[PDB]
Design a protein around this ligand. Structure first.
Ligand SMILES: [K+]
Ligand SMILES: [K+]
Ligand SMILES: [K+]
Ligand SMILES: [K+]
Ligand SMILES: [Mg+2]
Ligand SMILES: [Mg+2]
Ligand SMILES: [Mg+2]
Ligand SMILES: [Mg+2]
Ligand SMILES: [Mg+2]
Ligand SMILES: [Mg+2]
Ligand SMILES: [Mg+2]
Ligand SMILES: [Mg+2]
Ligand SMILES: [Mg+2]
Ligand SMILES: [Mg+2]
Ligand SMILES: [Mg+2]
Ligand SMILES: [Mg+2]
Ligand SMILES: [Mg+2]
Ligand SMILES: [Mg+2]
Ligand SMILES: [Mg+2]
Ligand SMILES: [Mg+2]
Ligand SMILES: [Mg+2]
Ligand SMILES: [Mg+2]
Ligand SMILES: [Mg+2]
Ligand SMILES: [Mg+2]
Ligand SMILES: [Mg+2]
Ligand SMILES: [Mg+2]
Ligand SMILES: [Mg+2]
Ligand SMILES: [Mg+2]
Ligand SMILES: [Mg+2]
Ligand SMILES: [Mg+2]
Ligand SMILES: [Mg+2]
Ligand SMILES: [Mg+2]
Ligand SMILES: [Mg+2]
Ligand SMILES: [Mg+2]
Ligand SMILES: [Mg+2]
Ligand SMILES: [Mg+2]
Ligand SMILES: [Mg+2]
Ligand SMILES: [Mg+2]
Ligand SMILES: [Mg+2]
Ligand SMILES: [Mg+2]
Ligand SMILES: [Mg+2]
Ligand SMILES: [Mg+2]
Ligand SMILES: [Mg+2]
Ligand SMILES: [Mg+2]
Ligand SMILES: [Mg+2]
Ligand SMILES: [Mg+2]
Ligand SMILES: [Mg+2]
Ligand SMILES: [Mg+2]
Ligand SMILES: [Mg+2]
Ligand SMILES: [Mg+2]
Ligand SMILES: [Mg+2]
Ligand SMILES: [Mg+2]
Ligand SMILES: [Mg+2]
Ligand SMILES: [Mg+2]
Ligand SMILES: [Mg+2]
Ligand SMILES: [Mg+2]
Ligand SMILES: [Mg+2]
Lengths: 72, 69, 381
RNA sequence: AAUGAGACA
RNA sequence: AGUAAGGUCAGCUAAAUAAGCUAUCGGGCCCAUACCCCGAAAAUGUUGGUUAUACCCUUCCCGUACUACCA
RNA sequence: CACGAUAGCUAGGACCCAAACUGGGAUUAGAUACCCCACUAUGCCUAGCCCUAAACCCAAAUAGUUACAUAACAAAACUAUUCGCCAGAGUACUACUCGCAACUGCCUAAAACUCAAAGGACUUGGCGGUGCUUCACAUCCACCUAGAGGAGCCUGUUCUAUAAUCGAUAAACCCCGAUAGACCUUACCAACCCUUGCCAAUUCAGCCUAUAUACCGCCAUCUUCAGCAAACCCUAAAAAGGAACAAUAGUAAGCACAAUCAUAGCACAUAAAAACGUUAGGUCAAGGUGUAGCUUAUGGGUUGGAAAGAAAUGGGCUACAUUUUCUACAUAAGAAUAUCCACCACACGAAAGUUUUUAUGAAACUAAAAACCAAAGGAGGAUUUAGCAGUAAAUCAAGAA
């Protein structure tokens, strides 16, 4: 019967939900690490825009927000 | 792997592209030593997982199988 | 026999080299004013080859006398026929009597290099993992009792160390120490995998009487000798340097530290714990002895692990040194291609296993001697 | 009242 | 160094009325093993002294533990 | 764009009762589970978030047809317009990436590598601590009688032992091959002899040498179970199945059961029978034989010798008495009776052991009788065997070799 496939998917999900719990703080470090590079790479993309347009400095009053930051 | 059990004479060589791969020696008996030059084909051995190359007998430092004498 | 062994060209050629070398030793000493340091070395080498050179010369004289037998049989007269059959048929047998003494002594005096043979050996048997059931576990018990009875036949001493029975009347694993004079000599080629092919009779596998193949692994490890640390002032350099801490005037004006340096090894042990140098010196000596003793044990572990992880291998039927086929009543060793019948007596130790070991050792000597004779040519070329 | 099968098509 | 402090069945505990559980040995139950039921065996680290012994003290031995500070 | 059970988060309020987690009790080898008791998050109201389900009627929306036509199963088959989705299985409701009031999260979603399969439905068989109905006449429970396990002895295995057989070894081995070993038997061991070495012949005799996993023979067993096999027919296909008596696809023969026969009337009962198969069940050692091995030796003959029981166990005989013991004797008798004691001496129970003698035999080590001797045993732990009437039990006798 099809139960031979639901059980196989049950064990994999049950083992994955223990791999996250055992190494929860390892994922916390990596997630924040990827978020910093995500923000930094976004800054370089905006920095490329104004440099190629001929300007020397970013337009006055423009401070790039940290979109990938925890807020509410 | 079962149900086929034996001792297959293999070797590990580094190819001309720089990669290092596992190869197999067909036939019975060989005199291959370390730092010898051989030629490898693209055949595969069904019994051995992972092995996907075979040395072609009769080229460079490996000769043909020697008849019993 | 020994005559066939001598007829090999490698053995005759090597003895020629000894004959040439032994004569060459005399020529250099008698003629050349050799220096005293070099002269003694040749003198010692001259004495060593003195029995070997004489043995080969007697072989040549004996071989030449055989050539006389061929010539006599050629020139045959009716009256001389009786004389030759009464002399040549006796001289040839007499010649065959003498060559046995020369050839046997050559291998009894050469004595290929041997080591250990006087250290207690631990014999470990396990349960191979190749087939389900107790066919392999039950078979482990039989061979374990085979060696135990074999030790009594060889007048050895058997010391049980570990014994773990299995659920279905078997041996999961076991280990014992065997002490004697020739333990490691005889029990050197018994290490490997012993395959068994039989129809189950007693045990869990007896529920279905179909021929099954199982395996078990035997580990033979020579246990090392004792340890006794020997130290003397020649091996220790003591640097009475100062120490760092908080003692006011006392620390600034006291060398309350010891740096022990083991000259033979190079180890540096420094103790600066207490206030007095006497306390520091006492502890430093104790630590150096303890650390040196630990190094010896770790050396023993590496040697044993590098040996017990070789005989075990991957625990597969592909590797095996002996196959026990109860179905056809044969016990065959793959190395020597020697097959023995009557497994019932073979598994009870005694002469059944002793006879097999004798050919294993003779084959070992044959391989080493044959290679050495070629290696003599390699050194000569 | 927990466990067991190896070289049978 | 000094001081403290302990050794008991194979193992771990409580008592000195040397016991309890487990392990070990024998048997039963089951197709066989384990569980389970039944029966038996088993020790006071060491020497000396403690009416006489043991729980005590002493000697030997192993191992455990704290402290080694002001200049 | 808007919404989305339940669980979960943030803030405030409510709390009868239920209740993850946690604590106690019990069960179990262990029970951080099922069962019992207590109580928290929470289930509830207001405001915000999360956006996941077997979110399954596993069947998409709108118009229709009952024509064509049964893979299987299920909820019968199909046409028109349109959108979404699907390219072997495992890796994978995963890694990396984009968005998200999410931060142990959701959505999107690969590859390296491994295998030649994964998967849907069905058929027969086996099994089920699945349910319903019916039934065990030695039988599972309830229940009857006599015994085994406790002791001695006899005998058979395992282990121990020796230079000194082999085979059986869950039910279906264990007074088994043996209705039978002092030599012989005998196949075992230690020595010492013989090499056309039984016969008409043979570059051949001989082998208790290996293989019951090559076999014929002769059986064990499910089994006092009723089913097996061949011919033929049927099925909108057939792996297979084949009955309804007021009958709906089956038919007549073969083997087995049945009937009959034996135990000198019938009856009943007991014997005898019990197919096809299952366990590669037991037997190369009744004998024969395939294949493999030996051939001045694994063959043949002579002489002597296979002891011994630390210990464990199975099946038996004799007991542990008063329904008994002893004597006479067939069954209506006399006497004894573990206790008393001022001393004594005593019951039941040696089958064992010592000594003597007889029987067989060339040889007694084997058997039997007597005298002496009087030990364990005071109704036997867990557990377990047999029997439904001339049966259990008690007692007597003969025969096979
Ligand atoms: K069925
Ligand atoms: K009995
Ligand atoms: K005889
Ligand atoms: K035969
Ligand atoms: Mg998985
Ligand atoms: Mg190929
Ligand atoms: Mg293939
Ligand atoms: Mg070429
Ligand atoms: Mg060329
Ligand atoms: Mg298994
Ligand atoms: Mg287990
Ligand atoms: Mg919701
Ligand atoms: Mg909710
Ligand atoms: Mg809620
Ligand atoms: Mg949160
Ligand atoms: Mg709240
Ligand atoms: Mg509440
Ligand atoms: Mg409540
Ligand atoms: Mg609890
Ligand atoms: Mg719903
Ligand atoms: Mg769906
Ligand atoms: Mg839908
Ligand atoms: Mg739609
Ligand atoms: Mg609509
Ligand atoms: Mg519609
Ligand atoms: Mg159909
Ligand atoms: Mg397709
Ligand atoms: Mg794929
Ligand atoms: Mg999910
Ligand atoms: Mg995910
Ligand atoms: Mg009964
Ligand atoms: Mg009786
Ligand atoms: Mg008894
Ligand atoms: Mg007995
Ligand atoms: Mg026997
Ligand atoms: Mg047997
Ligand atoms: Mg014979
Ligand atoms: Mg058979
Ligand atoms: Mg009939
Ligand atoms: Mg009749
Ligand atoms: Mg009748
Ligand atoms: Mg009958
Ligand atoms: Mg009948
Ligand atoms: Mg068989
Ligand atoms: Mg059987
Ligand atoms: Mg048999
Ligand atoms: Mg025969
Ligand atoms: Mg036999
Ligand atoms: Mg034959
Ligand atoms: Mg003979
Ligand atoms: Mg008994
Ligand atoms: Mg009987
Ligand atoms: Mg009587
Ligand atoms: Mg009377
Ligand atoms: Mg009496
Ligand atoms: Mg009497
Ligand atoms: Mg008597």
């Amino acid at each position: 019967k099809n139960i031979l496939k639901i059980r196989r998917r049950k064990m994999n999900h049950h083992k994955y939900r223990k791999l996250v719990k055992r190494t929860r703080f390892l994922r916390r470090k990596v997630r924040e690490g990827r978020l910093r590079q995500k923000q930094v790479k976004f800054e370089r993309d905006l920095k490329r825009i104004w440099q190629k347009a001929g300007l020397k400095e970013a337009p006055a009053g423009w401070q790039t927000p940290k979109i990938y930051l925890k807020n509410q | 792997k079962k149900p086929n059990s034996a001792n297959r004479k293999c070797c590990r060589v580094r190819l001309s592209t720089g990669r290092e791969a596992v190869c197999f020696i067909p036939g019975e008996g060989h005199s291959l030593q370390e730092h010898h030059v051989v030629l490898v084909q693209g055949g595969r051995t069904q019994d051995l997982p992972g092995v996907k190359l075979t040395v072609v007998r009769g080229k460079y430092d490996c000769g043909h199988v020697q008849k019993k004498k | 026999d020994t005559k066939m062994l001598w007829k090999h060209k490698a053995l005759q050629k090597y003895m020629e080299n000894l004959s040439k070398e032994y004569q060459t030793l005399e020529q250099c000493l008698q003629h050349i004013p050799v220096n005293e340091e070099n002269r003694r070395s040749l003198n010692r080498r001259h004495a060593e080859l003195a029995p070997l050179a004489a043995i080969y010369q007697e072989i040549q004289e004996t071989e030449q006398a055989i050539e006389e037998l061929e010539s006599m049989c050629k020139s045959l007269n009716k009256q001389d026929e009786k004389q030759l059959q009464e002399l040549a048929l006796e001289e040839r047998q007499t010649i065959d009597q003498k060559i046995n003494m020369l050839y046997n002594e050559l291998f009894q005096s050469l004595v290929p290099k041997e080591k250990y043979d006087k250290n207690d050996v631990i014999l470990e048997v396990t349960a191979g993992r190749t087939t389900g059931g107790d066919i392999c576990q039950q078979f482990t018990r039989e061979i374990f009792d085979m060696y135990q009875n074999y030790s009594c036949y060889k007048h050895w001493q058997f010391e049980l160390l570990n014994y773990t029975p299995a659920d279905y009347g078997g041996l999961h694993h076991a280990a014992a120490r065997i002490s004697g004079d020739g333990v490691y000599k005889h029990l050197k080629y018994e290490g490997g995998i012993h395959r068994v092919q039989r129809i189950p009779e007693v045990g869990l596998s007896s529920r279905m009487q179909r021929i099954h193949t199982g395996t078990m692994s035997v580990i033979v490890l020579p246990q090392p000798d004792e340890v006794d640390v020997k130290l003397d002032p020649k091996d220790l350099r003591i640097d009475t340097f100062r120490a760092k801490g908080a003692g006011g005037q006392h620390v600034n004006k006291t060398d309350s530290a010891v740096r022990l340096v083991h000259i033979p090894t190079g180890l540096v042990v420094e103790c600066q714990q207490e206030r007095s140098q006497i306390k520091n010196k006492e502890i430093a000596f104790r630590v150096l002895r303890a650390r040196l003793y630990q190094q010896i044990i770790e050396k023993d572990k590496r040697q044993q692990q590098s040996a017990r992880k070789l005989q075990v291998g991957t625990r597969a039927q592909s590797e095996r040194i002996r196959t026990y086929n109860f179905t056809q009543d044969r016990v065959s060793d793959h190395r020597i291609a020697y097959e023995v019948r009557d497994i019932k007596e073979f598994l009870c130790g005694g002469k059944g296993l002793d006879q097999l070991i004798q050919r294993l050792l003779q084959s070992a000597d044959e391989e080493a001697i044959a290679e050495l004779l070629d290696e003599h040519l390699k050194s000569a070329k």
